[PDB]
Amino acid sequence: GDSDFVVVANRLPIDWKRSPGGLVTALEPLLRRRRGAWIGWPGIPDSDEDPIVDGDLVLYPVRLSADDVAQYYEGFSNATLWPLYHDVIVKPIYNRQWWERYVEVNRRFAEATSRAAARGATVWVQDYQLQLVPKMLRELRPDLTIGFFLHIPFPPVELFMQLPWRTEITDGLLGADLVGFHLPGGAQNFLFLARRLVGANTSRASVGVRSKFGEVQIGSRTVKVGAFPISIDSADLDRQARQRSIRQRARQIRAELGNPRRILLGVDRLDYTKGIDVRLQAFAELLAEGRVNREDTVFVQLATPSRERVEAYRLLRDDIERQVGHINGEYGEVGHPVVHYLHRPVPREELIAFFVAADVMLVTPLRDGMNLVAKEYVACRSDLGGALVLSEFTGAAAELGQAYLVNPHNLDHVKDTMVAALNQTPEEGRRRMRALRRQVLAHDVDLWARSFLDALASTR
Amino acid sequence: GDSDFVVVANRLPIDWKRSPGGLVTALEPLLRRRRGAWIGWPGIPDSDEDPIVDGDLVLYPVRLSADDVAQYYEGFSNATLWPLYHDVIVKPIYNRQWWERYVEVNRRFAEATSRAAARGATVWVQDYQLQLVPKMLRELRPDLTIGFFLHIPFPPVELFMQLPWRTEITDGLLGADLVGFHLPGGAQNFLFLARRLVGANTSRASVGVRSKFGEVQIGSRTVKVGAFPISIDSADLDRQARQRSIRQRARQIRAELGNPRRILLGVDRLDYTKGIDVRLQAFAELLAEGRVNREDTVFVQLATPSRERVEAYRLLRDDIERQVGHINGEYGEVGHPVVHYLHRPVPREELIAFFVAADVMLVTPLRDGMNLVAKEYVACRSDLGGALVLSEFTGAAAELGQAYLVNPHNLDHVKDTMVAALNQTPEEGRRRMRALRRQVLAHDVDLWARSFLDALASTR
Amino acid sequence: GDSDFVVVANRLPIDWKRSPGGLVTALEPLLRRRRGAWIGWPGIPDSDEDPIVDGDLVLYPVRLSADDVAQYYEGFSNATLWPLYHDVIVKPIYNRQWWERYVEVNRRFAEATSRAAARGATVWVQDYQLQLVPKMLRELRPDLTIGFFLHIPFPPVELFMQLPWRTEITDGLLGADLVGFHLPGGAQNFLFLARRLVGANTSRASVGVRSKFGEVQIGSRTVKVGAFPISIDSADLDRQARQRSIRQRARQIRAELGNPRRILLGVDRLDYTKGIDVRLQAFAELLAEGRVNREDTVFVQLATPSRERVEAYRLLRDDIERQVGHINGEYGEVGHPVVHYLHRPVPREELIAFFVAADVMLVTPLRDGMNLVAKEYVACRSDLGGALVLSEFTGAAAELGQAYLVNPHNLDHVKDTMVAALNQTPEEGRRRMRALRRQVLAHDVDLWARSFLDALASTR
Amino acid sequence: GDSDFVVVANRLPIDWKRSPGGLVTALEPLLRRRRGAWIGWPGIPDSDEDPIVDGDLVLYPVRLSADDVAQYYEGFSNATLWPLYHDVIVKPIYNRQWWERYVEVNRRFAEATSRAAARGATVWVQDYQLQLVPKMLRELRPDLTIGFFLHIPFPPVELFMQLPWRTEITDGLLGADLVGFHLPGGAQNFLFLARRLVGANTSRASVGVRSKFGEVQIGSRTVKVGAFPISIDSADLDRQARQRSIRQRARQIRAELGNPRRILLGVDRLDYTKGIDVRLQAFAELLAEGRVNREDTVFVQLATPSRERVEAYRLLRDDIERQVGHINGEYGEVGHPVVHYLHRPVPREELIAFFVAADVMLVTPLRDGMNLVAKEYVACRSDLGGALVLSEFTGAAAELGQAYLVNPHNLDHVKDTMVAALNQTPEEGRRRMRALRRQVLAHDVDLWARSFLDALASTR
């Protein structure tokens, strides 16, 4: 093809209209200097595969049938790999037909990439749905420079080894010149896996942050291994949260809640990895114990619907919704719930207004690759108000140490911490938020993307 | 003893202070002409059995241990008889130890009654927990005139026959001179049961309302069988609902709900017989179909906690609470649920204010002996506003035919009917409420009690 | 058409080859004197509707699609009517699409019948899947004489009234000149239903067995209502069970079981109405209590697979299979289970050999229209050996009073009774079996069929 | 005290009579040269703590109440630590009261040890119930040399970190001079944990088998870390399996099973870690596919009852027992199951006879510290017959590579492997069994115990 920089991801960066923010916006000044392409599925079943010139980008759509989506995406990706890589919170399903479709779809992505990529081009493959693509691509196109970044956690070897296709996934990733993870921990698991399962020679030292890279020796070539913690466009969110309409909506939100003294907020895709049940349990017990005032404190949980065709998620929804009904029936009043729960997509401007209104942000995943909601909250609070309660089991906890960190399995401490955040002095709240903002403003998605691409370019 | 009129019920009519309204108040002008006694359990485990002179009444407390309560009341009564007599909505548990404790406790009630009752006294035994007492009492005291009234439904023979102790329960009831039920249907089941199981000769004709009594021949004596539909102190509730404080609270309730155009109301003890799940299902589907306006219509469900030590009820609570959380997550807004659910006791004055505020009363039991909430709502609406949606499977439906009657199993028609009630013209609403009030004002608890006692006195 | 006697049933009497025994064989000498037809579904989806001359009979196949089977048969029949008519052991599903398909299929059966039936012909409609056909047929063909026989129980009114389409089903049955049930109890429920729901005038007396018929007045015509308890071809089974090959197989069965002293046997379609779980519970507890000898006593349960596409049945299968595994793990030995359980169809000659081998026949339904397995066992034991343990909640219990009758809900007595049957003296066993055989040999399927047809002919 | 060598374990080595084999027998020639003591709970609630001189040993009983057992053993040990350390197959319960009792009981063991231990004595603490004892003991008695061996797996850090008391457990283990695990993998997890959680300086190299030890620097002292894979008294089992009575019982077992051509055998404590469900699933599917002959092949599963008061285990038992009943109902014949399942303790001589009779040993844990059943089978087959199917997720798989190794999550390969083992040539079977026996005969419990004690003595 005629593109010298190519991104490969499960989805095209569109909604059709181009998706705002995220990866595609981080790369904007690189596309202004390269002939760029994006390979992905357009998000609707059985489409054409004809290239679309989106001015700054050429889009190469990948055709997936409804059956492909069911077995490669909802199946192998969402119901085999996802629960396994997140510490088997739910039991992975090992299904051979799903594996076979995952292989076929990965090959299709690899072929689309080759079609788009010029000779010697740089290719950046994204995330867990496409772990076979680097090896497949190198076999098709040995001229290419290939990076891979995993956006979800990489599990310990004891769990990874469960996968019947463990060796094929590992060989898949080793097809890259650069394999990156958010955290040194994932990088180190990958190195150990390479030694244990593949018998490759690797470096033994700890892996640094955006530095002190590891290496895997594969025949004549070396695979670089690194940690690059993703972030957001901090400055842009900071600006957006100051808009008059956002601030007026935040005020209106508080009015509609009957002007509570304190608002706790949860914002997540409805997923068992997100620890929404832990928040509700802690809040319920604090109310029972009279440690939170049911008359002036309210918890808002915004759950975005997710993976409805996957049975585990329907069961999760049932459990969360029971907790909500239960807590309100026990501690609410007619015309005044203590928990407001919404199960629907939320426009970004509405989410930002909730960040601005929220006195306590509850981000309590059982396991999460990074979690950008934590960083978005921080970027929105230029008033230095608010408080972030953050699970240690997120990538974000490695950078946001000034937050109120919790082990979500330690319910006693989660409860103590919610009380502490709710009752913090203004000065202490400001001190923490000021320190968190310094980190998030300085370590943004631009720093992340440049660091990964510099590392990848270094493999030439 | 020295009492010529004796009431026997599972509980004493106290809360200690005397319980307002109900049976004990209906009998007030009879106690002004008799030496009256009340036999029952004081509602707290392991108490004395020393008589208490409550001026108008002598109270004879029955001692029950916590173990007695568990096996006779929570066990045999609430988990064997209750589900069986209500068309096995839940599977009855047949437990021999529970039966044996039920026999022992019934004997204890019979002995207390004999202690209190003077020679030739009239005795009125209440309800399903004490079905053995009439026979036990007649054996101890053949001089007594004994009436029994069942407040819950009497099931068809095909279901009743499941009971391993079917014959003992039947012989128990046949110890009375008069056996009464709310409805001719229950009376007719009893007659058929007497023929089928006991082989007694009975009358064959239909049983009337407060008339055309049936009879069972038992050796030399005849048992009278009748239908006496219970009611309320209609005039008293009518007066109470007009008080300024009630009306001001009803207005405040509507304000606290954000001034909806329409309020649907459910008021029940949390029980699987009450069809609360049907209301929530119908309401959810109407919202899905856009047939109810989620912006100006709200459903308030007040569930009084019940039988928490009985497993079936904990499961029911879980199911209802899931539905509540689900419906609000799908159709609510932050600061504005479509369903307000409270699981706690409610003071009577607060309940009356909710009756006055409610545009639609939802009384949809799967099976109910009478249901007095339906009649209380009617008595409270002297403004002739509101609408009553009423299950056919209540005793009340036999008298309140002007209500919007529903088969709760016919969900399509339950939904059609809720829409009809919500959108009725003012005139049509008034016509129905006027007719319902004529019935309820004329057929009150005084008429009921006098009719039963006249019938009983007739057996002398 | 050209047939003066027409049978209408859900299935054609074939397997293709003609089905042995049953109804079709009982009618053999009537078909030798009439021009007979049989209307039914050939048991395979989407077939022709072309008549088949089977010599003694003309077969009129009814076309049903797989979707028809799912919604009319597996749906409305097996998952609405079946659980409702059997005392809601499982919760009926009320589904409007199922009802609509049930109506359409019933109309199709009615149209096929009209096509086959000559002028003034006699029509005999069978069982609960076709309850609308008599009214539909009378509207199409007022010249026809129409009988209907219900082979399953007719439930009490309190349960029947749940059905949203209660009135349509009732009007459906009232289209017949004769409505028959196994038992007077079902007939009496039907009479009461007719008065309560339809407001028709009926007879009030008890209904006799094959006599003392009830009546329902419907405008100008009278519907006859009777009880006709079905039976088997007793003499034929008696002969078959004496064959040398049967007796040798029975001996071999005992040898293969390691020559136990006592064999208990259960034979049923796998259905929640059959009380298989009760047998296993009783047997397990008797073993725990040391009241049955685990070294010389064995229980064989032959469950024929049934209704696999209906969820309730998959759950039932799971529960039964757990009990089997549990009891063997607790009381068996390697090479020697105490329970042998087979989930597969069994050839009739093999079933007869099991009847001959079995010391105790366990027929313990929670609710059953008649149950012919009980009568078949009796007819097979011309040696006068064996023992029949029989639930009171079967139609058979009304005729087989000499059996060991049990209330399956009374587990203590079920256990006492199994011990009694296992340890009965030879003489007492013979006395009971002799009396049971006198009843079953004299009251066979020929007597049943002639009694119903005589009653029907009487309506002309 | 007056003992210079002290063993500390949850249970005393008794049954009272001294327990045969195991640890206590491995140490017999050391006790012949030392003044030895054993500290443990005598296995019955609320006992004395008075020392018992068992000739070769002094026994120091630890008093545990029934409540102690419930919260320290059944609670924290069996329902927190056990599932966590075995890759959270079941969700651990994090309970603070359980933790507090675990601390108190561990202190009680530490105090008993100090009472028994002479100055400068060597102490060997066993297994996961007593992980706090080394630190507690060092604080009480800094003069002691302390070893700890973990008999179950040590989980990856990502899972271990869930524990609210992660730091206290880690500090607990670091109180030892020597910490040992079966496998280098566990040792390496421990080293990484020490760096990540405690911030201690550790060695970075791979850990060897009984060599190349790791180290953790704790202030002035160094903790040695090693891998010592446990084994059995191979020679003793080899002799015992040759006894005439054992061989005659093995023959009788095959006769009682109706002389099958092939017997598969499972022997385990009933635990969710043991993968019994996987064996049954594979066997069921092989029968469905006609790849195993249901007429000449039989599977015997001997499950020893375990942890009945722990809810997870009652659920597991239910699931296994359903599978057993299901497979026999589908593929068995009357008098001939394909699966024989026994849930009861089995005498050791009977177990050995089953090892000798079994053509295929199925040892398929999802996760297991070592699993000695695999090695016992090998030691019993001096005839070189049989075949061992072994999960990779056992410690045993690191030494028994000549077995048929399986990933139990790869059901297709488990099935292929069972077929391969069942149909192996005599010569190939012998080749594998010969190689397995060479390993197991040379690497016995004596080698294991001496290696650990040599390492520990080296820390002086």
Ligand SMILES: O=P(O)(O)OC[C@H]1O[C@H](O[C@H]2O[C@H](CO)[C@@H](O)[C@H](O)[C@H]2O)[C@H](O)[C@@H](O)[C@@H]1O
């Ligand atoms: O559901 P799919 O389409 O498979 O996507 C998974 C998940 O991907 C992103 O989350 C992950 O990446 C971000 C950014 O690196 C991390 O912050 C998260 O911790 C990862 O889980 C999306 O943000 C998610 O919406 C999406 O579900």
Ligand SMILES: O=P(O)(O)OC[C@H]1O[C@H](O[C@H]2O[C@H](CO)[C@@H](O)[C@H](O)[C@H]2O)[C@H](O)[C@@H](O)[C@@H]1O
């Ligand atoms: O829970 P227990 O103490 O056993 O009491 C049952 C029930 O008794 C009353 O309800 C019944 O009687 C009334 C009056 O006749 C009828 O309207 C109901 O339909 C019957 O169920 C009480 O009102 C209930 O609170 C109580 O639960």
Ligand SMILES: O=P(O)(O)OC[C@H]1O[C@H](O[C@H]2O[C@H](CO)[C@@H](O)[C@H](O)[C@H]2O)[C@H](O)[C@@H](O)[C@@H]1O
């Ligand atoms: O499953 P379907 O096809 O709907 O048939 C139901 C049932 O019909 C028969 O049983 C019923 O009739 C007999 C004879 O009158 C009675 O003895 C039973 O008690 C009734 O249930 C068949 O025998 C059954 O196999 C069939 O399932």
Ligand SMILES: O=P(O)(O)OC[C@H]1O[C@H](O[C@H]2O[C@H](CO)[C@@H](O)[C@H](O)[C@H]2O)[C@H](O)[C@@H](O)[C@@H]1O
């Ligand atoms: O149930 P508890 O009393 O807590 O004991 C657990 C377990 O201990 C032993 O098994 C473990 O150690 C052996 C020997 O090292 C290993 O082979 C196993 O893999 C470990 O699980 C006993 O053998 C078990 O009976 C016991 O349950």
